[PDB]
Design a protein around this ligand. Sequence first.
Ligand SMILES: [Mg+2]
Ligand SMILES: [Mg+2]
Ligand SMILES: [Mg+2]
Ligand SMILES: [Mg+2]
Ligand SMILES: [Mg+2]
Ligand SMILES: [Mg+2]
Ligand SMILES: [Mg+2]
Ligand SMILES: [Mg+2]
Ligand SMILES: [Mg+2]
Ligand SMILES: [Mg+2]
Ligand SMILES: [Mg+2]
Ligand SMILES: [Mg+2]
Ligand SMILES: [Mg+2]
Ligand SMILES: [Mg+2]
Ligand SMILES: [Mg+2]
Ligand SMILES: [Mg+2]
Ligand SMILES: [Mg+2]
Ligand SMILES: [Mg+2]
Ligand SMILES: [Mg+2]
Ligand SMILES: [Mg+2]
Ligand SMILES: [Mg+2]
Ligand SMILES: [Mg+2]
Ligand SMILES: [Mg+2]
Ligand SMILES: [Mg+2]
Ligand SMILES: [Mg+2]
Ligand SMILES: [Mg+2]
Ligand SMILES: [Mg+2]
Ligand SMILES: [Mg+2]
Ligand SMILES: [Mg+2]
Ligand SMILES: [Mg+2]
Ligand SMILES: [Mg+2]
Ligand SMILES: [Mg+2]
Ligand SMILES: [Mg+2]
Ligand SMILES: [Mg+2]
Ligand SMILES: [Mg+2]
Ligand SMILES: [Mg+2]
Ligand SMILES: [Mg+2]
Ligand SMILES: [Mg+2]
Ligand SMILES: [Mg+2]
Ligand SMILES: [Mg+2]
Ligand SMILES: [Mg+2]
Ligand SMILES: [Mg+2]
Ligand SMILES: [Mg+2]
Ligand SMILES: [Mg+2]
Ligand SMILES: [Mg+2]
Ligand SMILES: [Mg+2]
Ligand SMILES: [Mg+2]
Ligand SMILES: [Mg+2]
Ligand SMILES: [Mg+2]
Ligand SMILES: [Mg+2]
Ligand SMILES: [Mg+2]
Ligand SMILES: [Mg+2]
Ligand SMILES: [Mg+2]
Ligand SMILES: [Mg+2]
Ligand SMILES: [Mg+2]
Ligand SMILES: [Mg+2]
Ligand SMILES: [Mg+2]
Ligand SMILES: [Mg+2]
Ligand SMILES: [Mg+2]
Ligand SMILES: [Mg+2]
Ligand SMILES: [Mg+2]
Ligand SMILES: [Mg+2]
Ligand SMILES: [Mg+2]
Ligand SMILES: [Mg+2]
Ligand SMILES: [Mg+2]
Ligand SMILES: [Mg+2]
Ligand SMILES: [Mg+2]
Ligand SMILES: [Mg+2]
Ligand SMILES: [Mg+2]
Ligand SMILES: [Mg+2]
Ligand SMILES: [Mg+2]
Ligand SMILES: [Mg+2]
Ligand SMILES: [Mg+2]
Ligand SMILES: [Mg+2]
Ligand SMILES: [Mg+2]
Ligand SMILES: [Mg+2]
Ligand SMILES: [Mg+2]
Ligand SMILES: [Mg+2]
Ligand SMILES: [Mg+2]
Ligand SMILES: [Mg+2]
Ligand SMILES: [Mg+2]
Ligand SMILES: [Mg+2]
Ligand SMILES: [Mg+2]
Ligand SMILES: [Mg+2]
Ligand SMILES: [Mg+2]
Ligand SMILES: [Mg+2]
Ligand SMILES: [Mg+2]
Ligand SMILES: [Mg+2]
Ligand SMILES: [Mg+2]
Ligand SMILES: [Mg+2]
Ligand SMILES: [Mg+2]
Ligand SMILES: [Mg+2]
Ligand SMILES: [Mg+2]
Ligand SMILES: [Mg+2]
Ligand SMILES: [Mg+2]
Ligand SMILES: [Mg+2]
Ligand SMILES: [Mg+2]
Ligand SMILES: [Mg+2]
Ligand SMILES: [Mg+2]
Ligand SMILES: [Mg+2]
Ligand SMILES: [Mg+2]
Ligand SMILES: [Mg+2]
Ligand SMILES: [Mg+2]
Ligand SMILES: [Mg+2]
Ligand SMILES: [Mg+2]
Ligand SMILES: [Mg+2]
Ligand SMILES: [Mg+2]
Ligand SMILES: [Mg+2]
Ligand SMILES: [Mg+2]
Ligand SMILES: [Mg+2]
Ligand SMILES: [Mg+2]
Ligand SMILES: [Mg+2]
Ligand SMILES: [Mg+2]
Ligand SMILES: [Mg+2]
Ligand SMILES: [Mg+2]
Ligand SMILES: [Mg+2]
Ligand SMILES: [Mg+2]
Ligand SMILES: [Mg+2]
Ligand SMILES: [Mg+2]
Ligand SMILES: [Mg+2]
Ligand SMILES: [Mg+2]
Ligand SMILES: [Mg+2]
Ligand SMILES: [Mg+2]
Ligand SMILES: [Mg+2]
Ligand SMILES: [Mg+2]
Ligand SMILES: [Mg+2]
Ligand SMILES: [Mg+2]
Ligand SMILES: [Mg+2]
Ligand SMILES: [Mg+2]
Ligand SMILES: [Mg+2]
Ligand SMILES: [Mg+2]
Ligand SMILES: [Mg+2]
Ligand SMILES: [Mg+2]
Ligand SMILES: [Mg+2]
Ligand SMILES: [Mg+2]
Ligand SMILES: [Mg+2]
Ligand SMILES: [Mg+2]
Ligand SMILES: [Mg+2]
Ligand SMILES: [Mg+2]
Ligand SMILES: [Mg+2]
Ligand SMILES: [Mg+2]
Ligand SMILES: [Mg+2]
Ligand SMILES: [Mg+2]
Ligand SMILES: [Mg+2]
Ligand SMILES: [Mg+2]
Ligand SMILES: [Mg+2]
Ligand SMILES: [Mg+2]
Ligand SMILES: [Mg+2]
Ligand SMILES: [Mg+2]
Ligand SMILES: [Mg+2]
Ligand SMILES: [Mg+2]
Ligand SMILES: [Mg+2]
Ligand SMILES: [Mg+2]
Ligand SMILES: [Mg+2]
Ligand SMILES: [Mg+2]
Ligand SMILES: [Mg+2]
Ligand SMILES: [Mg+2]
Ligand SMILES: [Mg+2]
Ligand SMILES: [Mg+2]
Ligand SMILES: [Mg+2]
Ligand SMILES: [Mg+2]
Ligand SMILES: [Mg+2]
Ligand SMILES: [Mg+2]
Ligand SMILES: [Mg+2]
Ligand SMILES: [Mg+2]
Ligand SMILES: [Mg+2]
Ligand SMILES: [Mg+2]
Ligand SMILES: [Mg+2]
Ligand SMILES: [Mg+2]
Ligand SMILES: [Mg+2]
Ligand SMILES: [Mg+2]
Ligand SMILES: [Mg+2]
Ligand SMILES: [Mg+2]
Ligand SMILES: [Mg+2]
Ligand SMILES: [Mg+2]
Ligand SMILES: [Mg+2]
Ligand SMILES: [Zn+2]
Lengths: 118, 131, 59, 122, 14, 204
Amino acid sequence: MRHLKSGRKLNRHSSHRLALYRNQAKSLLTHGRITTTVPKAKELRGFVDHLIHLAKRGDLHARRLVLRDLQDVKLVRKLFDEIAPRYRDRQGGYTRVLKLAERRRGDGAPLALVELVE
Amino acid sequence: MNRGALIKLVESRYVRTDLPEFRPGDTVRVSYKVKEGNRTRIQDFEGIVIRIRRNGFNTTFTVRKVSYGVGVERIFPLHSPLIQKIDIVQRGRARRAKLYFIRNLSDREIRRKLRADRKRIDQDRAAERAA
Amino acid sequence: AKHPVPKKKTSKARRDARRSHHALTPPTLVPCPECKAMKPPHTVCPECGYYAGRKVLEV
Amino acid sequence: MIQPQTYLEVADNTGARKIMCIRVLKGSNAKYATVGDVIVASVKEAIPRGAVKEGDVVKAVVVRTKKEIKRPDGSAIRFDDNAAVIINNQLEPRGTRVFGPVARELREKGFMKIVSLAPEVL
Amino acid sequence: PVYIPRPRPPHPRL
Amino acid sequence: MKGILGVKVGMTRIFRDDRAVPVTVILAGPCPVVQRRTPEKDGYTAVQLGFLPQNPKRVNRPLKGHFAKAGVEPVRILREIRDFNPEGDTVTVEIFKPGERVDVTGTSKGRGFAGVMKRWNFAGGPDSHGAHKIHRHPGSIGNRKTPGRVYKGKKMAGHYGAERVTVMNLEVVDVIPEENLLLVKGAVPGPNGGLVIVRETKKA
RNA sequence: CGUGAGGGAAAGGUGAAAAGAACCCCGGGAGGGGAGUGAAAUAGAGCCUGAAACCGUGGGCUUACAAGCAGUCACGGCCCC
RNA sequence: GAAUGCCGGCAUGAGUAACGAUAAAGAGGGUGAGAAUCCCUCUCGCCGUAAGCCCAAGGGUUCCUACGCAAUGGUCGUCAG
RNA sequence: CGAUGUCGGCUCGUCGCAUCCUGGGGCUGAAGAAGGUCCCAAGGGUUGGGCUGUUCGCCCAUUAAAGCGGCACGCGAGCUGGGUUCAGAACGUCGUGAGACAGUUCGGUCUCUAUCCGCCACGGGCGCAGGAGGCUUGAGGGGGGCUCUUCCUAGUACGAGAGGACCGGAAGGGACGCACCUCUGGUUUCCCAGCUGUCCCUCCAGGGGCAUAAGCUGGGUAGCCAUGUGCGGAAGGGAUAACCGCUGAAAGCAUCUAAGCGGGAAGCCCGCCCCAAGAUGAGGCCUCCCACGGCAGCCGGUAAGGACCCGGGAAGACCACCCGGUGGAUGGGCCGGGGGUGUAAGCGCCGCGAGGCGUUGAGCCGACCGGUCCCAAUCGUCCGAGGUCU
Ligand SMILES: [Mg+2]
Ligand SMILES: [Mg+2]
Ligand SMILES: [Mg+2]
Ligand SMILES: [Mg+2]
Ligand SMILES: [Mg+2]
Ligand SMILES: [Mg+2]
Ligand SMILES: [Mg+2]
Ligand SMILES: [Mg+2]
Ligand SMILES: [Mg+2]
Ligand SMILES: [Mg+2]
Ligand SMILES: [Mg+2]
Ligand SMILES: [Mg+2]
Ligand SMILES: [Mg+2]
Ligand SMILES: [Mg+2]
Ligand SMILES: [Mg+2]
Ligand SMILES: [Mg+2]
Ligand SMILES: [Mg+2]
Ligand SMILES: [Mg+2]
Ligand SMILES: [Mg+2]
Ligand SMILES: [Mg+2]
Ligand SMILES: [Mg+2]
Ligand SMILES: [Mg+2]
Ligand SMILES: [Mg+2]
Ligand SMILES: [Mg+2]
Ligand SMILES: [Mg+2]
Ligand SMILES: [Mg+2]
Ligand SMILES: [Mg+2]
Ligand SMILES: [Mg+2]
Ligand SMILES: [Mg+2]
Ligand SMILES: [Mg+2]
Ligand SMILES: [Mg+2]
Ligand SMILES: [Mg+2]
Ligand SMILES: [Mg+2]
Ligand SMILES: [Mg+2]
Ligand SMILES: [Mg+2]
Ligand SMILES: [Mg+2]
Ligand SMILES: [Mg+2]
Ligand SMILES: [Mg+2]
Ligand SMILES: [Mg+2]
Ligand SMILES: [Mg+2]
Ligand SMILES: [Mg+2]
Ligand SMILES: [Mg+2]
Ligand SMILES: [Mg+2]
Ligand SMILES: [Mg+2]
Ligand SMILES: [Mg+2]
Ligand SMILES: [Mg+2]
Ligand SMILES: [Mg+2]
Ligand SMILES: [Mg+2]
Ligand SMILES: [Mg+2]
Ligand SMILES: [Mg+2]
Ligand SMILES: [Mg+2]
Ligand SMILES: [Mg+2]
Ligand SMILES: [Mg+2]
Ligand SMILES: [Mg+2]
Ligand SMILES: [Mg+2]
Ligand SMILES: [Mg+2]
Ligand SMILES: [Mg+2]
Ligand SMILES: [Mg+2]
Ligand SMILES: [Mg+2]
Ligand SMILES: [Mg+2]
Ligand SMILES: [Mg+2]
Ligand SMILES: [Mg+2]
Ligand SMILES: [Mg+2]
Ligand SMILES: [Mg+2]
Ligand SMILES: [Mg+2]
Ligand SMILES: [Mg+2]
Ligand SMILES: [Mg+2]
Ligand SMILES: [Mg+2]
Ligand SMILES: [Mg+2]
Ligand SMILES: [Mg+2]
Ligand SMILES: [Mg+2]
Ligand SMILES: [Mg+2]
Ligand SMILES: [Mg+2]
Ligand SMILES: [Mg+2]
Ligand SMILES: [Mg+2]
Ligand SMILES: [Mg+2]
Ligand SMILES: [Mg+2]
Ligand SMILES: [Mg+2]
Ligand SMILES: [Mg+2]
Ligand SMILES: [Mg+2]
Ligand SMILES: [Mg+2]
Ligand SMILES: [Mg+2]
Ligand SMILES: [Mg+2]
Ligand SMILES: [Mg+2]
Ligand SMILES: [Mg+2]
Ligand SMILES: [Mg+2]
Ligand SMILES: [Mg+2]
Ligand SMILES: [Mg+2]
Ligand SMILES: [Mg+2]
Ligand SMILES: [Mg+2]
Ligand SMILES: [Mg+2]
Ligand SMILES: [Mg+2]
Ligand SMILES: [Mg+2]
Ligand SMILES: [Mg+2]
Ligand SMILES: [Mg+2]
Ligand SMILES: [Mg+2]
Ligand SMILES: [Mg+2]
Ligand SMILES: [Mg+2]
Ligand SMILES: [Mg+2]
Ligand SMILES: [Mg+2]
Ligand SMILES: [Mg+2]
Ligand SMILES: [Mg+2]
Ligand SMILES: [Mg+2]
Ligand SMILES: [Mg+2]
Ligand SMILES: [Mg+2]
Ligand SMILES: [Mg+2]
Ligand SMILES: [Mg+2]
Ligand SMILES: [Mg+2]
Ligand SMILES: [Mg+2]
Ligand SMILES: [Mg+2]
Ligand SMILES: [Mg+2]
Ligand SMILES: [Mg+2]
Ligand SMILES: [Mg+2]
Ligand SMILES: [Mg+2]
Ligand SMILES: [Mg+2]
Ligand SMILES: [Mg+2]
Ligand SMILES: [Mg+2]
Ligand SMILES: [Mg+2]
Ligand SMILES: [Mg+2]
Ligand SMILES: [Mg+2]
Ligand SMILES: [Mg+2]
Ligand SMILES: [Mg+2]
Ligand SMILES: [Mg+2]
Ligand SMILES: [Mg+2]
Ligand SMILES: [Mg+2]
Ligand SMILES: [Mg+2]
Ligand SMILES: [Mg+2]
Ligand SMILES: [Mg+2]
Ligand SMILES: [Mg+2]
Ligand SMILES: [Mg+2]
Ligand SMILES: [Mg+2]
Ligand SMILES: [Mg+2]
Ligand SMILES: [Mg+2]
Ligand SMILES: [Mg+2]
Ligand SMILES: [Mg+2]
Ligand SMILES: [Mg+2]
Ligand SMILES: [Mg+2]
Ligand SMILES: [Mg+2]
Ligand SMILES: [Mg+2]
Ligand SMILES: [Mg+2]
Ligand SMILES: [Mg+2]
Ligand SMILES: [Mg+2]
Ligand SMILES: [Mg+2]
Ligand SMILES: [Mg+2]
Ligand SMILES: [Mg+2]
Ligand SMILES: [Mg+2]
Ligand SMILES: [Mg+2]
Ligand SMILES: [Mg+2]
Ligand SMILES: [Mg+2]
Ligand SMILES: [Mg+2]
Ligand SMILES: [Mg+2]
Ligand SMILES: [Mg+2]
Ligand SMILES: [Mg+2]
Ligand SMILES: [Mg+2]
Ligand SMILES: [Mg+2]
Ligand SMILES: [Mg+2]
Ligand SMILES: [Mg+2]
Ligand SMILES: [Mg+2]
Ligand SMILES: [Mg+2]
Ligand SMILES: [Mg+2]
Ligand SMILES: [Mg+2]
Ligand SMILES: [Mg+2]
Ligand SMILES: [Mg+2]
Ligand SMILES: [Mg+2]
Ligand SMILES: [Mg+2]
Ligand SMILES: [Mg+2]
Ligand SMILES: [Mg+2]
Ligand SMILES: [Mg+2]
Ligand SMILES: [Mg+2]
Ligand SMILES: [Mg+2]
Ligand SMILES: [Mg+2]
Ligand SMILES: [Mg+2]
Ligand SMILES: [Mg+2]
Ligand SMILES: [Mg+2]
Ligand SMILES: [Mg+2]
Ligand SMILES: [Mg+2]
Ligand SMILES: [Zn+2]
């Protein structure tokens, strides 16, 4: 049973999944868009949204909060300076996931893109 | 439909609103209506509230006292109609929300850990300077 | 346990009867509105990168 | 929540101090005694010259317990020990007094002597 | 297969 | 013999004569009758109740014509009530008074594939003293050459829950007709949000 | 294979002649399709003949209320000659 | 037609068990007919009296570089002992 | 004998009835209570311990009672392996000996993959002469079925007394079963806090990794849960067992019987809960589409409808099931509440300092109750009646 339970496992233990999400966050925030499996994408959405939102708050406390997951003063500076302001009026929904048509050759996995919106 | 709202609605006719706020660590006296066949009297119970678990109308707090050599704890519904009143006897300062640990503590050792909360005692006297 | 084992060889009729549920179901396909190419629904078109009416990626 | 092999502190001045429950007198196959139930028990430790002595197979009413007791009014009460009072076949205290609080459940169960002898009825 | 795995010992029917 | 369709809202507890009374809140009414079963037409008696109004955007033509034959706005569910035939075209909580005793049927929570221990309260095996990978196992399931088979109805692992269950003789604690709410003492099958039927009790 | 003494296999055949398939097409290749050689190419080198188990495609009859060492005897139906 | 016969071949079990330590992965870029699996960069995890380095035995070209991917590699492979 | 694993235990039961208990009876050397003995009855129930490998048995403490048997002395492709039943070793005993022993003693490898039947679950297919969406009858199955104490009647009947009822009426339990999570109590793998060592970011402050597949510790929501809560055993109708009769001959009397009728059990039938029209005997009712185009047949294009694909779900192994798909609150975000934690960071003040105080119930914050189209359920596709004959 799994009733009313939130959160995919992604076949990783408690610290691997987290490093997975943090690394996915850095890469997406860095490149603007990335390709993952569809399940990992859906879980990244909220993981990144929160950080983008904390950046909109702007305060020092938010910056330190974010640096726990992102750890890159430069990229957190990019988050607060160039990414955060283009969302000032967007009440959530800072990312989107669109499925791709073809799967990998070697394990058949379905893929999708995660991107920051406009 | 808002199932949460309806539940609060059933609860509202029983929701109590005449009881002083308290916290874990506070010493407190609960005046409790008890039946003793076939009459009903008011039995007092005075101790440290060591636990308060919140679920709206269903909140319940746990009070600990030492009684004639034996440690006794009692749980009360915070909105029970059986509580005459709650008298605040002492505002103590705890650093966590559940004080289960005080059970394995000596008398003076508890005295140390739950020193008087001057800040909420100054409030205790500030209010009650009323019209 | 004690190493269970097939007591008899499965007949050609029984072998294949078990495979009565083994056919592939063909892929669900829909034409792409922009370039009229057949592609699975709810995916970005891999022949023109159009989805929801707009170009979403280079092909 | 007392069961066979449970040790109970002895709450009177019978001379006993510890007893080990060997049976819950509550029908065929009751699993646990609470406050108010009777148990047969063996005296595992008693002080010298007491009306009860080590080895005696006595009866007892459980006056207070470590597992909380729930109540129709929605409240509960929990003690720091499991305690018992040694009784006779008429369910009367063999001792001359009771030490400590006892559970109010004892009153409406016909253990009125022990409830009076009790310093506190909680 | 020049190596034959030795058979398991029988259940003792004595 | 009266019935009504409802939705399990949640559990709480009230206070009544200085007693904690655990109750389940059921949002019962209002239930429009959609079709009456007659011995002439069907061989038995019943009223097919309707419950929870539905967006016509989703109600197909065969059912729209069914509702229309009753002058009822399309509703989400229909369920009959055997041997019950009210006077109006609407059935509400007001058919139940406090102190009455009801029978509640709901769809039980779904355990899915359940082990022999959870479903059948089998004792399993030991956890030490040599047990070999059988700690949650059923044990034996038969004899030997006689009968050389396993009984029908033998208790084994398999899907458990998500089935129709009925709880008998539930006291009615309060009726709040303006919010269409039924307060019943005790527990009702299944999850909050799930559909239930509240009938008069068959006990005495 | 065995430290060693020692043990100890499997594996023959295009065609008369290489005339052993230029060149073109699909293909990364492998393979194939044409062209061409030959009396013959399901003699194309994984090559004479090419059985059987075994695997598959196509067609006729047949089968989802039925009890079976699978056949046999009878009658009926459908398809073929 | 049987010798748990001998040699060979092909079935069944079956698209089943398994794919060999639970130190662990993610992205971006490049190459290529083809990329989870090769190269590059960033991020993450593992060892650190070692899972790092130097000898001896044993192994015998496996070293380095170019060109390759039929087979070998428990998948894939453009990579490789 | 080209192998049918052997004791006891554990697990899971199922049947018998020569019945341990509970129900119904006759007789009694049955006053009452409580027994005896036999009859009927297999529905349910039939406890926990000490000793021993034990089965068996004795003992302790209870109980309504602590029943006896069959199923390869039920059950090792379900477990165990203490005993038996290999090789070691020792004692007693026998034997010159090697060795022996229903003599003893300590130790001594129990085989990952289920093909067929059977079984628990779950689908796919076809069928139920038109095609569909709903709601249903219940043939037939299955589940359940236990019992105690106290009290009123009443210290009455009975009894010299002790003792102590029938019938009838209350209340409260044990064990079991189904469901549930409000309370009580668990868990809650990253929801919060505190702590050590080390490495790091960025020097301070603040943080991150690792110490487990949570480093450790104090807590802890939803969910899943029992130790917790609700509820069930029936009632009642019917037909009977033994047993007791009414009326009544054969057979002037008598006779429960031969004609006929009544009473009578925890048992049988029904009632209750659950499955259930593949019930091929394929049931019923409501509503929807409808005489299509071309040669009981064939191929088309549709209708009502359906599926595919998608967002999801206290539904779930896959499948199935249920909700939703922009005329939309389905998931993710965002916002409010609830809830956990227990007063963040930064700054100011105090102290040489560890710290302390204030700002501040602050900061953080999964799942719960809702709100809001900010992001994704874009766009579509394929099936799908024309109704055989008497
Ligand atoms: Mg699990
Ligand atoms: Mg969810
Ligand atoms: Mg895994
Ligand atoms: Mg995996
Ligand atoms: Mg870790
Ligand atoms: Mg978040
Ligand atoms: Mg998409
Ligand atoms: Mg796809
Ligand atoms: Mg690949
Ligand atoms: Mg096994
Ligand atoms: Mg075995
Ligand atoms: Mg094993
Ligand atoms: Mg198995
Ligand atoms: Mg095996
Ligand atoms: Mg075949
Ligand atoms: Mg065949
Ligand atoms: Mg088969
Ligand atoms: Mg298969
Ligand atoms: Mg198929
Ligand atoms: Mg002693
Ligand atoms: Mg002694
Ligand atoms: Mg004491
Ligand atoms: Mg051999
Ligand atoms: Mg072998
Ligand atoms: Mg229902
Ligand atoms: Mg269960
Ligand atoms: Mg259980
Ligand atoms: Mg267990
Ligand atoms: Mg073992
Ligand atoms: Mg095993
Ligand atoms: Mg184990
Ligand atoms: Mg199990
Ligand atoms: Mg056997
Ligand atoms: Mg048989
Ligand atoms: Mg189900
Ligand atoms: Mg060699
Ligand atoms: Mg050699
Ligand atoms: Mg030749
Ligand atoms: Mg030649
Ligand atoms: Mg020639
Ligand atoms: Mg030649
Ligand atoms: Mg080319
Ligand atoms: Mg070629
Ligand atoms: Mg070709
Ligand atoms: Mg060619
Ligand atoms: Mg010729
Ligand atoms: Mg030929
Ligand atoms: Mg030839
Ligand atoms: Mg020749
Ligand atoms: Mg040939
Ligand atoms: Mg050939
Ligand atoms: Mg051939
Ligand atoms: Mg064929
Ligand atoms: Mg039939
Ligand atoms: Mg047929
Ligand atoms: Mg036959
Ligand atoms: Mg004939
Ligand atoms: Mg022969
Ligand atoms: Mg042969
Ligand atoms: Mg054989
Ligand atoms: Mg062979
Ligand atoms: Mg074959
Ligand atoms: Mg083979
Ligand atoms: Mg094979
Ligand atoms: Mg498979
Ligand atoms: Mg298999
Ligand atoms: Mg498998
Ligand atoms: Mg294997
Ligand atoms: Mg596998
Ligand atoms: Mg392995
Ligand atoms: Mg590997
Ligand atoms: Mg591996
Ligand atoms: Mg680690
Ligand atoms: Mg990454
Ligand atoms: Mg890569
Ligand atoms: Mg690759
Ligand atoms: Mg590749
Ligand atoms: Mg590389
Ligand atoms: Mg070191
Ligand atoms: Mg070390
Ligand atoms: Mg050398
Ligand atoms: Mg070598
Ligand atoms: Mg190279
Ligand atoms: Mg290769
Ligand atoms: Mg290759
Ligand atoms: Mg290749
Ligand atoms: Mg080559
Ligand atoms: Mg290989
Ligand atoms: Mg390979
Ligand atoms: Mg390998
Ligand atoms: Mg290449
Ligand atoms: Mg190299
Ligand atoms: Mg034999
Ligand atoms: Mg054999
Ligand atoms: Mg044999
Ligand atoms: Mg054998
Ligand atoms: Mg038996
Ligand atoms: Mg009998
Ligand atoms: Mg009897
Ligand atoms: Mg009797
Ligand atoms: Mg008598
Ligand atoms: Mg008798
Ligand atoms: Mg019985
Ligand atoms: Mg029996
Ligand atoms: Mg016993
Ligand atoms: Mg024992
Ligand atoms: Mg002992
Ligand atoms: Mg023992
Ligand atoms: Mg014994
Ligand atoms: Mg014995
Ligand atoms: Mg008796
Ligand atoms: Mg046996
Ligand atoms: Mg037995
Ligand atoms: Mg056995
Ligand atoms: Mg075994
Ligand atoms: Mg055995
Ligand atoms: Mg067996
Ligand atoms: Mg066997
Ligand atoms: Mg042994
Ligand atoms: Mg052993
Ligand atoms: Mg001797
Ligand atoms: Mg001698
Ligand atoms: Mg011997
Ligand atoms: Mg003997
Ligand atoms: Mg000895
Ligand atoms: Mg040893
Ligand atoms: Mg031994
Ligand atoms: Mg084997
Ligand atoms: Mg099978
Ligand atoms: Mg098979
Ligand atoms: Mg068979
Ligand atoms: Mg079906
Ligand atoms: Mg039908
Ligand atoms: Mg029936
Ligand atoms: Mg049948
Ligand atoms: Mg009286
Ligand atoms: Mg008299
Ligand atoms: Mg009575
Ligand atoms: Mg809870
Ligand atoms: Mg809750
Ligand atoms: Mg709790
Ligand atoms: Mg977190
Ligand atoms: Mg941590
Ligand atoms: Mg650190
Ligand atoms: Mg620092
Ligand atoms: Mg590190
Ligand atoms: Mg490390
Ligand atoms: Mg914890
Ligand atoms: Mg806890
Ligand atoms: Mg929780
Ligand atoms: Mg009768
Ligand atoms: Mg007579
Ligand atoms: Mg007469
Ligand atoms: Mg007669
Ligand atoms: Mg009669
Ligand atoms: Mg009964
Ligand atoms: Mg039904
Ligand atoms: Mg049907
Ligand atoms: Mg049906
Ligand atoms: Mg039939
Ligand atoms: Mg799903
Ligand atoms: Mg739909
Ligand atoms: Mg659509
Ligand atoms: Mg929504
Ligand atoms: Mg939402
Ligand atoms: Mg929220
Ligand atoms: Mg909040
Ligand atoms: Mg709040
Ligand atoms: Mg709060
Ligand atoms: Mg502060
Ligand atoms: Mg601060
Ligand atoms: Mg600070
Ligand atoms: Mg200073
Ligand atoms: Mg808070
Ligand atoms: Mg709106
Ligand atoms: Mg389209
Ligand atoms: Zn396109």
